[PDB]
Design an enzyme around this catalytic site. Structure first.
Site, PDB file in Angstrom:
ATOM      1  N   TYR A   1       0.791  -1.227   0.000  1.00  0.00           N
ATOM      2  CA  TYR A   1       0.000   0.000   0.000  1.00  0.00           C
ATOM      3  C   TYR A   1       0.823   1.277   0.000  1.00  0.00           C
ATOM      4  O   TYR A   1       0.461   2.245  -0.672  1.00  0.00           O
ATOM      5  CB  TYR A   1      -0.940   0.013   1.202  1.00  0.00           C
ATOM      6  CG  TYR A   1      -1.589   1.351   1.426  1.00  0.00           C
ATOM      7  CD1 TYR A   1      -1.151   2.193   2.447  1.00  0.00           C
ATOM      8  CD2 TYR A   1      -2.635   1.777   0.620  1.00  0.00           C
ATOM      9  CE1 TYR A   1      -1.744   3.426   2.668  1.00  0.00           C
ATOM     10  CE2 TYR A   1      -3.239   3.013   0.823  1.00  0.00           C
ATOM     11  CZ  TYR A   1      -2.788   3.832   1.852  1.00  0.00           C
ATOM     12  OH  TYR A   1      -3.393   5.051   2.065  1.00  0.00           O
TER      13      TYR A   1
ATOM     14  N   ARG B   1      -4.764  -2.011  -1.618  1.00  0.00           N
ATOM     15  CA  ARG B   1      -6.157  -1.958  -1.161  1.00  0.00           C
ATOM     16  C   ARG B   1      -7.206  -2.632  -2.056  1.00  0.00           C
ATOM     17  O   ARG B   1      -8.364  -2.774  -1.666  1.00  0.00           O
ATOM     18  CB  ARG B   1      -6.549  -0.508  -0.912  1.00  0.00           C
ATOM     19  CG  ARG B   1      -5.745   0.145   0.209  1.00  0.00           C
ATOM     20  CD  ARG B   1      -6.143  -0.386   1.595  1.00  0.00           C
ATOM     21  NE  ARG B   1      -5.563   0.445   2.650  1.00  0.00           N
ATOM     22  CZ  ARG B   1      -4.482   0.134   3.357  1.00  0.00           C
ATOM     23  NH1 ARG B   1      -3.855  -1.022   3.173  1.00  0.00           N
ATOM     24  NH2 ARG B   1      -4.046   0.981   4.275  1.00  0.00           N
TER      25      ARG B   1
ATOM     26  N   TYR C   1      -2.582  -1.784   7.745  1.00  0.00           N
ATOM     27  CA  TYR C   1      -4.033  -1.929   7.852  1.00  0.00           C
ATOM     28  C   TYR C   1      -4.507  -2.808   9.025  1.00  0.00           C
ATOM     29  O   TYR C   1      -5.482  -2.478   9.692  1.00  0.00           O
ATOM     30  CB  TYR C   1      -4.593  -2.502   6.556  1.00  0.00           C
ATOM     31  CG  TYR C   1      -6.103  -2.528   6.490  1.00  0.00           C
ATOM     32  CD1 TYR C   1      -6.813  -1.443   5.978  1.00  0.00           C
ATOM     33  CD2 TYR C   1      -6.823  -3.659   6.891  1.00  0.00           C
ATOM     34  CE1 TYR C   1      -8.198  -1.484   5.851  1.00  0.00           C
ATOM     35  CE2 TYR C   1      -8.212  -3.708   6.769  1.00  0.00           C
ATOM     36  CZ  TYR C   1      -8.890  -2.622   6.243  1.00  0.00           C
ATOM     37  OH  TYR C   1     -10.260  -2.674   6.054  1.00  0.00           O
TER      38      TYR C   1
HETATM   39  N1  NAP Z   1      -5.403  -5.943  -1.597  1.00  0.00           N
HETATM   40  C1  NAP Z   1      -6.700  -5.771  -1.324  1.00  0.00           C
HETATM   41  O1  NAP Z   1      -7.582  -5.826  -2.168  1.00  0.00           O
HETATM   42  C2  NAP Z   1      -7.110  -5.492   0.128  1.00  0.00           C
HETATM   43  C3  NAP Z   1      -8.485  -5.280   0.500  1.00  0.00           C
HETATM   44  C4  NAP Z   1      -8.934  -5.017   1.853  1.00  0.00           C
HETATM   45  C5  NAP Z   1      -7.954  -4.981   2.884  1.00  0.00           C
HETATM   46  N2  NAP Z   1      -6.580  -5.199   2.506  1.00  0.00           N
HETATM   47  C6  NAP Z   1      -5.600  -5.191   3.564  1.00  0.00           C
HETATM   48  O2  NAP Z   1      -4.583  -4.179   3.381  1.00  0.00           O
HETATM   49  C7  NAP Z   1      -3.296  -4.673   3.777  1.00  0.00           C
HETATM   50  C8  NAP Z   1      -2.346  -4.551   2.613  1.00  0.00           C
HETATM   51  O3  NAP Z   1      -1.046  -5.003   2.973  1.00  0.00           O
HETATM   52  P1  NAP Z   1       0.217  -4.101   2.665  1.00  0.00           P
HETATM   53  O4  NAP Z   1       1.451  -4.719   3.072  1.00  0.00           O
HETATM   54  O5  NAP Z   1       0.234  -3.471   1.366  1.00  0.00           O
HETATM   55  O6  NAP Z   1      -0.322  -2.943   3.778  1.00  0.00           O
HETATM   56  P2  NAP Z   1      -0.183  -2.137   5.145  1.00  0.00           P
HETATM   57  O7  NAP Z   1       0.210  -3.291   5.824  1.00  0.00           O
HETATM   58  O8  NAP Z   1      -1.398  -1.512   4.765  1.00  0.00           O
HETATM   59  O9  NAP Z   1       1.132  -1.368   4.789  1.00  0.00           O
HETATM   60  C9  NAP Z   1       1.075  -0.006   4.518  1.00  0.00           C
HETATM   61  C10 NAP Z   1       2.454   0.432   4.877  1.00  0.00           C
HETATM   62  O10 NAP Z   1       2.987   1.468   4.079  1.00  0.00           O
HETATM   63  C11 NAP Z   1       3.406   2.547   4.828  1.00  0.00           C
HETATM   64  N3  NAP Z   1       3.169   3.797   4.101  1.00  0.00           N
HETATM   65  C12 NAP Z   1       2.030   4.549   3.951  1.00  0.00           C
HETATM   66  N4  NAP Z   1       2.312   5.619   3.210  1.00  0.00           N
HETATM   67  C13 NAP Z   1       3.598   5.539   2.903  1.00  0.00           C
HETATM   68  C14 NAP Z   1       4.413   6.387   2.156  1.00  0.00           C
HETATM   69  N5  NAP Z   1       3.923   7.497   1.614  1.00  0.00           N
HETATM   70  N6  NAP Z   1       5.774   6.078   1.967  1.00  0.00           N
HETATM   71  C15 NAP Z   1       6.334   4.955   2.505  1.00  0.00           C
HETATM   72  N7  NAP Z   1       5.518   4.131   3.242  1.00  0.00           N
HETATM   73  C16 NAP Z   1       4.169   4.402   3.446  1.00  0.00           C
HETATM   74  C17 NAP Z   1       2.823   2.395   6.241  1.00  0.00           C
HETATM   75  O11 NAP Z   1       3.861   2.604   7.204  1.00  0.00           O
HETATM   76  P3  NAP Z   1       4.354   4.078   7.706  1.00  0.00           P
HETATM   77  O12 NAP Z   1       3.132   4.698   8.273  1.00  0.00           O
HETATM   78  O13 NAP Z   1       5.457   3.804   8.681  1.00  0.00           O
HETATM   79  O14 NAP Z   1       4.930   4.777   6.464  1.00  0.00           O
HETATM   80  C18 NAP Z   1       2.246   0.994   6.297  1.00  0.00           C
HETATM   81  O15 NAP Z   1       2.643   0.294   7.463  1.00  0.00           O
HETATM   82  C19 NAP Z   1      -3.573  -6.121   4.253  1.00  0.00           C
HETATM   83  O16 NAP Z   1      -3.782  -6.158   5.688  1.00  0.00           O
HETATM   84  C20 NAP Z   1      -4.856  -6.502   3.539  1.00  0.00           C
HETATM   85  O17 NAP Z   1      -5.503  -7.623   4.131  1.00  0.00           O
HETATM   86  C21 NAP Z   1      -6.152  -5.447   1.149  1.00  0.00           C
END
Ligand code: NAP
Ligand code: NAP
Lengths: 182, 182
Positions: A32, A67, A148
């Site tokens: 994300y 997302r 998330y």
């Molecule tokens: N893929 C789908 O369709 C979908 C649907 C519903 C729910 N989800 C959920 O969303 C999550 C997705 O996993 P993921 O690993 O991508 O997500 P996250 O675990 O959502 O990771 C987002 C990470 O990026 C960082 N971030 C935000 N803005 C940033 C920026 N401008 N520059 C650098 N870093 C930034 C955040 O840390 P900092 O704040 O430290 O920067 C955050 O910890 C899962 O839990 C999934 O189940 C996904």
């Protein structure tokens, strides 16, 4: 009273360039954070240069990174990254043990080892990209904040993990620039 | 040009019982044969009693044991084996040299030393649970035959290996029964 502490390490851009240049195989697992910072472009550029320099560089995508399903494949395609180097979690997860460096860019929940190391975690059992199995991991996000799922990620405190703190686009822009000057 | 010799040793239930009774640390490496025979159940009860007698009993699961991903973990769970005594190969392989007894139950390819002893083998270099490094190994299968990889397994002929031949369930049922009665 009670207390528990954790230690993480932070590296600078010069150290990151060193790690990149010394690595022969690299896997990038974007999440994300890359989407929010619109960092597809500088990372695509960087990947092109490293590849032309003879390095094996591929992307590993979690089925639920970002997302929306397949959101990362779309953004990377929009940046012109070749489709042959964008692999799905199931096709690449097994390469982590044999990988020199993993660049975790704005990913957290999708690379959270608590899914396998914490029996009582809310994501326990959920499939994740096993980045901690590689030789060196560089985590690029703004802080040690949550994702998330709102849970801490043990990989932040592992010996082979280094945090490169900052906005994803700014950091990739800088890396891409310093590699262009090599 | 040469001709080596190898000898295997077949034992009976009472012999296996003596080996178990005498062991302080036991590791069970289950495989496809356990699933096929539905031996999860008796083995689960057996581990409970042995653990109750003060013995350290754990399971060592190969990443590709059985015919489906996590198949052994799922079947053992369903039979009620505590998740905390089921370990993946990578987290338990280093303990074989320090283990008293290993019960290979319906596993073959996943414990085949040819992967490490025969450079010309089709499984050369592939990781396997190094059960033969322990003090005593008991193999439970129906014959001296092959597994899915269709290659002979040298451990059947090592001095510290005993063969306890027969269907895995019939055998585990008997062991559990005798253990109970003591
Ligand atoms: N893929 C789908 O369709 C979908 C649907 C519903 C729910 N989800 C959920 O969303 C999550 C997705 O996993 P993921 O690993 O991508 O997500 P996250 O675990 O959502 O990771 C987002 C990470 O990026 C960082 N971030 C935000 N803005 C940033 C920026 N401008 N520059 C650098 N870093 C930034 C955040 O840390 P900092 O704040 O430290 O920067 C955050 O910890 C899962 O839990 C999934 O189940 C996904
Ligand atoms: N895990 C996966 O998803 C997956 C997928 C594709 C391929 N594979 C392959 O499958 C193999 C799995 O390794 P493994 O050690 O579990 O397998 P094997 O090497 O397939 O072992 C099966 C053993 O159990 C015995 N057996 C069968 N029925 C039995 C019974 N009723 N009672 C006692 N023994 C019985 C057989 O010997 P006897 O006939 O002498 O009894 C056989 O040699 C690997 O080569 C792996 O790469 C796994």
């Amino acid at each position: 009273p009670m207390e528990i502490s954790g230690t993480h390490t932070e590296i600078n851009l010069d150290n990151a360039i060193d790690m990149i240049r010394e690595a022969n195989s690299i896997i990038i697992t974007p999440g994300y954070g890359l989407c929010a910072a619109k960092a597809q472009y500088p990372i695509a550029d960087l990947v092109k240069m490293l590849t032309e320099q003879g390095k094996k560089v591929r992307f590993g995508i979690h089925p639920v990174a970002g997302r929306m399903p397949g959101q990362l494949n779309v953004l990377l395609a929009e940046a012109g990254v070749p489709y042959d180097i964008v692999l799905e979690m199931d096709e690449i997860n097994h390469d982590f043990p044999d990988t020199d460096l993993v660049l975790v860019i704005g990913a957290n929940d999708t690379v959270n080892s608590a899914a396998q190391e914490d029996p009582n975690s809310i994501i326990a059992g959920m499939p994740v990209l096993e980045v901690w199995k590689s030789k060196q991991v560089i985590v690029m996000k703004r802080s040690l904040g949550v994702g998330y799922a709102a849970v801490d990620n043990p990989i932040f405190y592992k010996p082979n993990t280094a945090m490169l703190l900052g906005d994803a686009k700014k950091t990739c822009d800088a890396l891409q620039a310093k590699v262009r000057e090599s």
